[PDB]
Structures are given as C-alpha cells and as structure tokens.
Ligand binder design. Structure first.
Ligand SMILES: O=P([O-])([O-])O[C@@H]1[C@H](O)[C@H](O)[C@@H](O)[C@H](O)[C@H]1O
Ligand SMILES: O=P([O-])([O-])O[C@@H]1[C@H](O)[C@H](O)[C@@H](O)[C@H](O)[C@H]1O
Ligand SMILES: [Ca+2]
Ligand SMILES: [Ca+2]
Ligand SMILES: [Ca+2]
Ligand SMILES: [Ca+2]
Ligand SMILES: [Ca+2]
Ligand SMILES: [Ca+2]
Ligand SMILES: [Ca+2]
Ligand SMILES: [Ca+2]
Ligand SMILES: [Ca+2]
Lengths: 150, 151, 151
C-alpha cells in the first residue's frame, strides 16, 4: 500500500529526471549556454544598453556578467555563434574609471582588450564583449547583442 | 524502514528538480514568453493571417491568445509592445455577426475594445487584433498579425 | 503513518511538477520544435554546411535529424515546411559510396528518397537533405541547409 505508492512515485520521478534532462538540451539549443550554476541566453537581436538591461531585469535575470574565465568563455560561444558583440552588465556611469556590477560591487574578474577601458571621446561607460572574448568600453547608446544571465 | 530511506532519497530528487526547473522557466520565457497566473503566452515572432495563426497554435497543443482578465491582457500587451506588432486574438464573430466567441463558442468574459469598436468596418471584420496600447479592434481575418499562442 | 503523510505530500508535489513541466514543454516546442514519440526535433532556424551543422548538434548533446519512420519524417517535415528551407539529415555515404549510414555506422532502417534518388550527382553527393514535401535527395555536404537537431 505504501511500498507500492513509493514504487509508483519512484517511477514518476525517474521519468521526470529523464524528461527534464532532454528538455534542458532542447531549451539551450541554439541560444543558451550553461556554465556552473549560471545560464546565459541570447535574445538574438541588438538593443542599446538601457533597453537591453530592462529586458533582462523584466525577465527575472540580468545582463551577462561573466565573473571568471570559464563564464567568459561560455558567453563568448554565444557571441561567436551570433557574430555580434554583446553588452555586459557593468558600467562606470556612477564613478568614471570605476566599473561596477548592477549591485555597485567592484569587478571580481575582467578581460579587457589591450588599451581598454579608454573612455573614448569621454563617453564610454558601458562594456561590450567581442567574438575573441575580450572586453571594450563602449557608448551605452550603441546597439549590441542582448544576452541575459539566469 | 527501507521505505523511509527511499522517501528521503526521493525528497532530495524532487527538491533538485524543483530548483533546476525554476531556473529553466525563466530561461525559457526569455524573450518571447510571458507568464500570467497559470497561463503562458508565447509569440512565434512573425505575422500570419488568422486561419494560419489559429492552426499553428492548435497544432502546437494550445490556442490563439485569449486574454480573460485585465491582468492577462496586460501581460499579452507586453509581448506585442516588445515585438512592436499588433497580434490576433482567438475570438471571432464569424458565426453570428456582433457576437464574439472563443474557439469553444463561449461568449466573452472580458474585452478591451477601443472606443467605437467593434465596428465591422466595410461589413467584413470578424477577427480581433490587440494593439501595442493593449486595446482591441475587430479586423479582417485575412490581414497578417503577430502569432501569439497561449498554453 | 507520518511516512504516509510524507509520501502523499511528495506525490502532490511531483504531480504539480509533472503538470508544470508538461506545460513548459509545449511552450518550448512552439514554433521551432516537434515531438514525436520520445524524440524531439528542434531547428536553429538558419542554414549551415553539413560539417558545421553536425558540430552544432553534437555540441548541443544531440545529433542531426535522423528520421527512422514515416511518423518521424512527417514531424521533421513540419519544421522544414515552417521554415521553407530544406534541411540536412545526419546520414552520409562518405565511408562506402551508395551505402547511407547513421553516425554510428548502422545501415538505414527507413528511407524516403525522391524518385531517382540517391543519384550521387556530379559523382559527389554524400549528404542527405529533406525537402518541404518530406522526400529526400542526396546533396553535396558543402552546400548550406537548414540546421535541425534531434534530442
Ligand atoms: O569609434 P571608432 O574609432 O570606430 O572605434 C573605437 C576604437 O576601436 C577604440 O580602440 C575603442 O576603444 C573604442 O571603444 C571604439 O569606439
Ligand atoms: O483600414 P484602415 O481604414 O486604415 O483602418 C480602419 C480604421 O482604423 C477603423 O477605425 C477600424 O475600426 C478598422 O478596423 C480599420 O481597418
Ligand atoms: Ca562617464
Ligand atoms: Ca567611462
Ligand atoms: Ca573603448
Ligand atoms: Ca461577419
Ligand atoms: Ca464582424
Ligand atoms: Ca474595427
Ligand atoms: Ca562519395
Ligand atoms: Ca554519395
Ligand atoms: Ca541527388
């Protein structure tokens, strides 16, 4: 009576494990990347920073925020796949020359291209990631690939 | 006894799936879905005439967007705004002019008509579109609108 | 007794998880996937040459579309019709000319060749495309076709 109910529940949970694992692969193809506990997903279109940031937040995530080389490499795969540089979440909008996450926390990882960040024209407060994975500071009003993290 | 061991094992398995799946729900709905209550809207991201749109949703195991409250209507409008394209709703007055019904044939429980609508303009508007401002307008079914299904 | 309350609780949780998962699965497949039996096809929605397409699917944990029955073929055909783009299948006769095999090296168990196919045209066609009518043609692997993976 119990041992039988438990057997049935075991069957249900085993099915769910199999079905969920299949579904994860389907979901991530072709626009997602799983790295550790984080998932990057591209919207597959470009927006200016403010609009990109709102899209991610409204979706219950935030803009791509790579915090290690492995996360950066995973994000880089999407950028390469779409062949479009992407916005990161980080900006020095508050204090010029100091890049912060959306929390106001200072950077725990960076991958700046040589000579960057350079605030070119005195007006680069957002960050793009190139197909080579390197970062450049860029004007926030430019349109870049939208990639959120969950 | 061994029935207890199995339970605590299962509890761990269900907790893992619950956590893992919660993350995937958010990932899935970005950028083309909107959850509202127990309903999920999902856009195909392109336009079709009504008959084609209706068939796409039905074959996918759902139906055309059928907002049944202000909340559902606002959630749908978010997609329409995001895509910048008016969308078809499920409801028509094809059977009885002036009487809009769901695919089931049930009368409307909610509507958000723009002022003066529905007006059966030209004597030939039996479908319904939702605009970027959330308001509804009867429109010819042969026109192409954003395909948004509900599941 | 307490164990019974726990089994009861966990089963309600699992059944709620089952229902939510089933809903999210329908949403996931619309409009770029098709489920048939235990298999799921999903298109990337762009074209690539065969080697590039095959790598995309392998890297994603699946393989190129490999229809093994009329039912599987028909499900795949829906996606091809939807995108209006012929797709590559997984199968090649690269090893032994005229002998098409799955990635494992197994001989075909099902085929749906268009009349006169496979013909190895130019004496150089070792990949397989599926047309919008669901029929197959051998095609040079260097050509670009719709990417559809199976999982
Ligand atoms: O404006 P532009 O000379 O085409 O491009 C700039 C340069 O590549 C510069 O090295 C970089 O630091 C700037 O962020 C870019 O805007
Ligand atoms: O076709 P059109 O004359 O540009 O526009 C019409 C008008 O906007 C009318 O107010 C509305 O009720 C009709 O549904 C539309 O078709
Ligand atoms: Ca500044
Ligand atoms: Ca700056
Ligand atoms: Ca710069
Ligand atoms: Ca009429
Ligand atoms: Ca009418
Ligand atoms: Ca009207
Ligand atoms: Ca050959
Ligand atoms: Ca050949
Ligand atoms: Ca041929």
């Amino acid at each position: 009576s119990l041992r039988q109910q438990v057997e049935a529940l075991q069957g249900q949970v085993q099915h769910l494990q199999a079905a969920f694992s299949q579904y994860k692969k389907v979901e991530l193809f072709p626009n997602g990347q799983s790295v550790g506990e984080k998932i990057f997903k591209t919207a597959g279109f470009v927006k200016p920073f403010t609009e990109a940031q709102l899209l991610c937040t409204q979706a219950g995530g935030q803009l791509a925020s790579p915090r290690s080389a492995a996360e950066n490499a995973a994000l880089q795969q999407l950028v390469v796949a779409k062949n479009e540089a992407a916005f990161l979440s980080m900006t020095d909008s508050k204090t010029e020359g100091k890049f912060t996450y959306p929390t106001g926390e200072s950077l725990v990882y960076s991958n700046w291209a040589p000579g960057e960040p350079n605030d070119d024209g005195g007006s680069e407060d957002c960050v793009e990631i190139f197909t080579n994975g390197k970062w450049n500071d860029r004007a926030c009003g430019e349109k870049r690939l939208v990639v959120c993290e969950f």
